[PDB]
Nucleic acid binder design. Structure first.
Lengths: 149, 329, 124, 135
RNA sequence: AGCUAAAUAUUGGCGAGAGACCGAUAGCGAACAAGUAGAGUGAUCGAAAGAUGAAAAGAACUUUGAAAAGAGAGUUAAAUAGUACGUGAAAUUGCUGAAAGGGAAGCAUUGGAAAUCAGUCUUACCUGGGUGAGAUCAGUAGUCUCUCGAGACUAUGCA
RNA sequence: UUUCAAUGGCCCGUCUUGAAACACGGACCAAGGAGUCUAGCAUCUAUGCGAGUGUUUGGGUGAUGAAAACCCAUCCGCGAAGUGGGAACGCCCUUGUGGCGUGCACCAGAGCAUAGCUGUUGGGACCCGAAAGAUGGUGAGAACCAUCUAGUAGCUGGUUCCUGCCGAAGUUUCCGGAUAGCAGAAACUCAGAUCAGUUUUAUGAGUAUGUAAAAUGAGAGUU
RNA sequence: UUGAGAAGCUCAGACGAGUAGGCAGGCGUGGAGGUUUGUGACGAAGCCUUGGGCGUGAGCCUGGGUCGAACAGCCUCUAGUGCAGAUCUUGGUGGAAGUAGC
RNA sequence: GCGAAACCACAGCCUGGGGAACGGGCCAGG
RNA sequence: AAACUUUCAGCAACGGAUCUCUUGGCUCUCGCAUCGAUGAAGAACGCAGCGAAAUGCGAUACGUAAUGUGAAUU
C-alpha cells in the first residue's frame, strides 16, 4: 500500500507537486509541512495528522489506515482550543502513542497557524492603504487625451 | 496480501445497500507504473495518421529548395506490444483505480466519494436522461470531478487549435457497465465522463497520460464480471483464453513491515547512530595549544627540562697528547 | 552562513562584443589555436565548476531568502511553514486583480514578496 | 546495469533491494550481501534454473536433502522431461506457472525473496544456487 | 477456338471525412493576380506579393502652397492603428544631450569620479489592573449531520 | 552604466605542418541552413512469458467517433527435442577443524517477442561543390530546352546548447590489413599473494652485467 | 533531535591540464497525452530597457515601457529541435561616395 | 541637376629585435 | 575651445524580424464511375458587372424556361 503508493506518487507523477530549484512542494491541503517528502506525503502515509484553519478556528485532522477505502469518512477532526497551552495538550492526547515526529510536525503547524491568525487580526485593526490596480487602456487614453487638452 | 474483503453497492439514490461483492483478484494485481507507461507510450501511437511533404517539393539551405531528408509516409507509425504485456498493463491499471490515494494524485476530486472502488446498482444501466445521470453523480458525490472538468476547459496553446484541437480539459469519472440499455447516452454529454464496456477496457482510458489511478465507477454487473475478464493467478480467465493474472516478485510490498518486524529486528546488530557528530573539526597544535598537549602527552605536567648537572669543579679533560696533536703543524 | 558569491560578473562569450551577430550567451570555444580555450594570460575567464557557490547559500537572494514563483493565492499559502526561507515572487502574467489578493494574503502569512508593488497604486 | 543499483525500473525489485540493503548492512551475513549483489545484476547474469536442476543439486552425491530452502535470484523454470518432482522449498525472484504448480501440487512451498528474508533473515540453512551462465 | 462477376490496383476524375503535418524565406511554383505578370524566334522558363479598425467612424471645416503636401482641427478605446496602415527586432541613417579624443584598437582586472538603482525598519513580545464584550466557559436548555462523543449551528447567562 | 588611471592583452574559423607561419573563408544584420527516415545483422539493457515464445495475413468485434481498444480459428517463423570455489550448518576462546558445495576454471535444455541504446551494411543516406551519358523535342556541324538524375567528386568547404568525469597513441613485428601495445567496459579470483623504467646481499659469468632470495612502495593477477 | 523525496540524511579523506576518443548529468525549441479545481482585456504572446535577482554555465525569474489575444509550469511522448562561418540561400542596409562619371 | 560599380576581418608614423612571415598587430626606443 | 572622429542615451527615420493569425498547402483514409462527329479537351472573339493579371455567360451573351426558397442586389 504505502510503499507502492509512494513509489508512484513520489517518483513518477503527483498532481500536487510543485517542482522547485532547491526543494519540491506539495499543494495538497493536508500536508503539514507543505514540502514533498516521504514523511510529509498525506497520500503515502495511512496514519497522518495535520492542523488546518477553518473560518478562524484550528482543527486537528487525523486519518487512520482502516478508513483508507472510504474517502468521505477518511479524515476526522477535533476542534483545537483557543488556549495555546491546552491546544498542545489536545494534540498530545489525540495523537497518543503516535510517532514523535508526527506530533512534532503538528505542533509546529499549530504555532504557525496561530501566528497567522494573530497577524490577520492585527491587520484588521490597522489601517492600510488600498491597492489600486493600474489599467493600461485607461492610462493610454488619459495620456493621449491630456496631450490634446 | 490482506486486502479489504468485500465491496459495498450503492443504490441510485446514493445510499448504501445490504449487498456486497467480493473484491476481484485484479485489484490485488501488481501495480507497475513503469510497465503501464511503456505500454501506454506504444498504444498511444496506434491511431496516428501519416504525414509527409510532397515528393515534387523543392539544397536544404536554399530558399524554396528541398528540405533535408524529406518526411515520408512509410515511417514506422504503429508499434507492437506483446498481448501479455498489454494485459499486464491493463490489469495493473485496474488495480491502481482501486486505490484512493492514486486517484487523488491523478487529479480526481474524490475527497467526498463514499467508497473506492465505487460500485452502483444496475438500475443505472438503464438511465435514459442526462438529468438522471447527473443526479446519481451528485448523490454519490462524484460530481466534484465533473465540476473540475467543466472549469478546466481552456483554449489549447499553440498551433493545435489551428488543427481541430481547439479546446483542452481534464478527465472525469470513467463509468464501466455490462450492458448498454441507456447508460451510454445518459452520461456521454457530461463533460469528462467516459463510458466503456467491461469486456473491452482501454489502457488509454484506465491510465490517461500514462498516469495510474483513474476514477472509475462500476455498475454491479460490471464488477461481478471482473473475475471472468481477468481471472486470478491460479484460475484462468474465462473471457481470455489461457490468461492468468501476473504474479509479483514480492509477497508483502510493505517493506517497512519486513524491515521493522520482530523476525528481523531480533537478529540485527545494535544500530549505530544517525548523522554522526563531527570529530576533529579543527587541528590544534600541541606546541601552541597547551590543553591539546596535556591530552596527547600525559607527561608534560612533570617534565623538568633545565636540570643542573655541572658545578664549580669541572674537570677540564684534554691531555697534553691530544693538545699537541691539535696544535700541530 | 551569510551569502557569499564567488563571482558577480557574468561569463560573456568570446568576441561577442566585436560582432553583433554573435550573442553574449556563453559558448565553449572549440578552436585549438584559440587562446581563450588554451587559457592564456589576459584572456577572458571560462565557466568552471570551481566557481560554483555554496550549496547551503545557493539560490538565495541577498536577503537570505529563496524566490518562490507564485501565480495565485494557493501558491502563497504554501509558504506558511517556510516564510523564513522563501520569498514569494508573483509571476509577470498575473493580473493586477490577483496581485492584490496575493499581496494581502502574503501579509498575513508573514511572507516577503519580491515585487509586491507592481501594477498597483496606493490610496490611504 | 550493476554495481551501485539495479538498472531495472520494476518498483518491486527496488523494494526487494531496499530490504536486502538493510539486511546486508545491519547483519553480519555474507548471504545477505550475496543476495544484494545478485539483485543488482542484469537478466543475462541471472540465468534461470530448472526444477530438475534444483532436485538434482539438493539430492546430490550424499543426498541428505532434509528441509533446507533453495534460494536463486532468478527464474525457476520447469523441466517437463522429469516425471516426479520431490518435496522442495524454493525461494526465487520468479516462478513459472508450470514450475509453481508442480512444486505445490506434489511437494512443498514456493517463496519470494521477502518471504525468505522473514524465515531466514541471516540466510541460515539455505542452499543458494545459480544457473549456467554459458547460455 | 471463345466468354466470364467477386476478392485486387488506383498521384487522374466526381464528391466526402480526417490529421501528434506546414504556418506566408514554411506548406503546392501559386493562401493575393498564379501557370499569372514577365523572359525567350521557339521548345520552354516563371516570380514577388497575406493582417487598419468592432464599425470607414477613411480625417468635415479653416489656412499656406502652382502642385504634391503641410499646419490648425476632427473620428476612434487607441492615429505609439491614417490605407507607405496589427505587432514593429537587428543592420543602417538623421537630430539632440553627455562624455572621451594622439595611431593597433576593442577587451580583461582593480578602484575613483559622475549618473542611476536595489532591497533591509520597532513592532512586536511579555506582564498587571480596570472597563465592557463572547464560546471552544455554563453545579445550562434544543436541532442537524457523522461515529456514547465528534463537528456544525439555535436560543439563554458573561461568574 | 559612461569614462579615467595603473597592469595586462593580437583575428576569429578552416587547412597546413612538429605547433606554426603561410595560404584560404569572413562589409554588416535578420531569417533559413547540414547524421535524417527505413530495411537487415550483431551487441548491451529493460520488459513479458518461458521449453517454449510471437494477437494485428486474416476473422470476430467495437451505439457514438469505429483507422483506436478488445477477443483468436487454422497455419507459420525461431527455439527445443580428482581439486580450487560462492553460500550455509555444527564444533573450536578465536584462528581453525568437520560435514555440504552453486557458477566457473582444472582433472538436465534457454529461448522467443517487444522496446531503447550502440556499432555496422544498404538504400539520395550529414549538407554542398566538375562536365557525364542517354531519351524526347525546339531553332538553324554546332547551338538551345526538358526528363532519366538526389548519375558524381578516394577530394573541397561547412556541419548548430552547457557542464562534469575518464583519456591516448602519435610505433615494435610481419605487412592496404592482421597485429601487438597504449586507454575504457564487462566476467572473475584474490591479501595465509603477489607485483615493481627502484636499490640491494653475495657469487655466477664477463667497475659494469646477470642470478635466486633482503630493503622500499603499492593489494594484485587476470580472461 | 524530529535530519525516512533510503532516489533521503549524514561523516571522512584524497584529488582537479587536456587534443582525438569514451561516458554521465543537465539547459532550450515546435507538436502530443496527462496535470496545475494553472495565467490572461484589471492585459496573453512578442519586443525594448545604464531596473532587480537566480544558476559554474546552457539558461531562467522579475520591474518599467510598448503592446493587443492568447499562453505557460510539472510527468511522459514525439521531432523538419539550438548556427558566426559553408567564395552558404533569400531579404534588408552600409563605407567606397555624392566619388568614377553623364 | 542626375549618378554608379569593383573592393571591404579590423585598425593604420618610423628604427631594431621577436628564431615558425613575425608585423600592421609583440618587445625596446624615436 | 570649435570642428571632425569615437562612445553612450533620447527622439525621429529605414527595414520588415518576432509574435499572434489563416476561406491555403501537404498527407492519409472513404464513396463513386460520368468526355467526343448529337462536335469534346483546348484556343480565339464578344457580352456586363467590374479591379482584373479574376469570374460568369454566348447575339436568348452576370444567362432564358421549370421546381423552389420567399423580399432582396449593394
Amino acid at each position: 500500500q504505502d510503499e507502492v503508493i509512494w513509489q508512484v506518487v513520489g517518483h513518477e507523477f503527483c498532481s500536487y507537486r510543485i517542482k522547485g530549484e532547491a526543494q519540491n512542494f506539495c499543494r495538497n491541503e493536508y500536508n503539514v509541512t507543505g514540502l514533498c517528502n516521504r514523511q510529509s506525503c498525506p497520500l503515502a502515509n495511512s496514519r497522518y495528522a495535520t492542523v488546518r484553519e477553518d473560518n478562524g478556528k484550528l482543527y486537528l485532522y487525523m486519518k487512520t489506515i482502516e478508513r483508507a477505502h472510504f474517502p468521505s469518512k477518511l479524515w476526522q477532526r477535533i476542534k483545537l482550543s483557543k488556549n495555546y497551552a491546552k491546544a498542545l495538550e489536545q494534540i498530545d492526547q489525540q495523537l497518543l502513542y503516535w510517532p514523535g515526529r508526527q506530533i512534532h510536525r503538528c505542533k509546529q503547524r499549530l504555532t504557525r497557524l496561530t501566528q497567522y491568525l494573530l497577524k490577520a487580526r492585527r491587520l484588521a485593526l490597522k489601517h492600510q492603504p488600498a491597492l489600486i490596480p493600474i489599467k493600461p487602456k485607461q492610462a493610454h487614453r488619459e495620456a493621449s487625451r491630456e496631450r490634446k487638452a | 496480501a490482506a486486502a479489504r474483503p468485500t465491496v459495498s453497492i450503492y443504490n441510485k439514490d446514493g445510499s448504501v445497500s445490504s449487498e456486497t461483492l467480493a473484491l476481484p483478484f485484479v485489484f490485488k494485481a501488481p501495480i507497475r507504473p513503469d510497465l503501464v507507461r511503456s505500454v501506454h507510450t506504444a498504444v498511444a501511437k496506434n491511431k496516428r495518421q501519416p504525414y509527409a511533404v510532397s515528393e515534387k517539393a523543392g539544397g536544404n539551405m536554399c530558399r524554396s529548395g528541398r528540405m533535408f531528408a524529406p518526411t515520408k509516409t512509410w515511417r514506422k507509425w504503429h508499434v507492437k506490444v506483446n498481448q501479455n504485456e498489454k494485459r499486464y498493463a491493463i490489469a495493473s491499471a485496474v488495480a491502481a483505480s482501486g486505490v484512493p490515494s492514486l486517484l487523488l494524485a491523478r487529479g480526481h476530486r474524490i475527497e467526498e466519494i463514499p467508497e473506492v472502488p465505487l460500485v452502483v446498482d444496475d438500475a443505472v444501466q438503464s438511465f435514459q436522461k442526462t438529468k438522471e445521470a447527473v443526479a446519481l453523480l451528485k448523490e454519490i458525490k462524484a460530481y466534484r470531478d465533473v465540476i473540475k472538468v467543466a472549469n478546466s476547459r481552456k483554449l489549447r496553446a499553440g498551433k493545435g487549435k489551428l488543427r481541430n484541437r481547439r479546446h483542452v480539459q481534464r478527465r472525469g469519472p470513467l463509468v464501466v457497465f455490462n450492458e448498454d440499455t441507456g447508460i451510454v447516452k445518459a452520461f456521454r454529454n457530461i463533460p469528462g465522463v467516459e463510458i466503456v464496456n467491461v469486456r473491452r477496457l482501454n489502457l488509454l482510458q484506465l491510465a490517461p497520460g500514462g498516469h495510474l489511478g483513474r476514477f472509475v465507477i462500476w455498475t454491479k454487473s460490471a464488477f461481478g464480471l471482473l473475475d471472468s475478464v481477468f481471472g486470478s493467478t491460479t484460475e484462468v480467465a474465462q473471457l481470455k483464453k489461457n490468461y492468468f493474472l501476473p504474479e509479483n516478485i514480492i509477497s508483502n510490498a510493505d517493506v517497512t513491515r519486513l524491515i521493522n518486524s520482530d523476525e528481523i529486528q531480533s537478529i540485527v546488530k545494535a544500530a549505530g547512530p544517525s548523522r554522526v557528530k563531527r570529530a576533529h573539526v579543527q587541528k590544534k597544535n600541541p606546541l601552541k595549544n597547551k590543553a591539546v598537549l596535556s591530552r596527547l602527552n600525559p607527561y608534560a605536567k612533570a617534565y623538568k627540562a633545565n636540570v643542573k648537572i655541572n658545578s664549580e669543579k669541572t674537570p677540564k679533560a684534554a691531555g697534553e697528547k691530544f693538545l699537541s696533536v691539535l696544535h700541530e703543524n | 552562513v551569510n551569502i557569499i558569491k564567488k563571482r558577480t560578473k557574468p561569463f560573456k562569450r568570446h568576441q561577442s562584443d566585436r560582432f553583433k551577430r554573435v550573442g553574449e550567451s556563453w559558448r565553449k570555444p572549440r578552436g585549438i589555436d584559440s587562446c581563450v580555450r588554451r587559457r592564456f594570460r589576459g584572456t577572458i575567464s571560462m565557466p568552471k565548476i570551481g566557481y560554483g557557490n555554496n550549496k547551503k547559500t545557493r539560490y538565495c537572494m541577498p536577503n537570505g531568502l529563496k524566490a518562490f514563483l507564485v501565480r495565485n493565492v494557493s501558491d502563497v499559502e504554501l509558504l506558511l511553514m517556510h516564510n523564513k526561507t522563501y520569498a514569494a515572487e508573483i509571476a509577470g502574467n498575473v493580473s493586477a486583480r490577483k496581485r492584490v489578493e496575493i499581496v494581502e494574503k502574503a501579509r498575513a502569512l508573514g511572507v516577503k514578496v519580491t515585487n509586491a508593488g507592481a501594477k498597483v497604486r496606493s490610496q490611504e | 546495469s550493476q554495481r551501485s543499483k539495479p538498472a531495472s525500473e520494476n518498483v518491486y525489485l527496488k523494494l526487494l533491494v531496499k530490504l536486502y540493503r538493510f539486511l546486508a548492512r545491519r547483519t553480519d551475513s555474507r548471504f545477505n550481501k550475496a543476495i544484494l549483489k545478485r539483485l543488482f545484476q542484469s537478466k543475462t547474469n541471472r540465468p534461470p534454473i530448472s526444477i530438475s536442476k534444483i532436485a538434482a543439486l539438493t539430492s546430490r552425491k550424499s543426498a541428505s536433502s532434509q528441509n533446507k530452502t533453495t534460494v536463486v535470484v532468478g527464474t525457476v523454470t520447469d523441466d517437463e522431461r522429469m516425471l516426479t518432482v520431490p518435496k522442495l522449498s524454493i525461494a526465487a525472484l520468479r516462478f513459472t506457472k508450470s514450475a509453481r504448480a508442480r512444486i505445490l501440487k506434489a511437494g512443498g512451498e514456493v517463496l519470494t525473496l521477502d518471504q525468505l528474508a522473514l524465515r531466514a533473515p541471516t540466510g541460515s540453512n539455505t542452499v543458494l544456487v545459480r544457473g549456467k551462465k554459458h547460455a
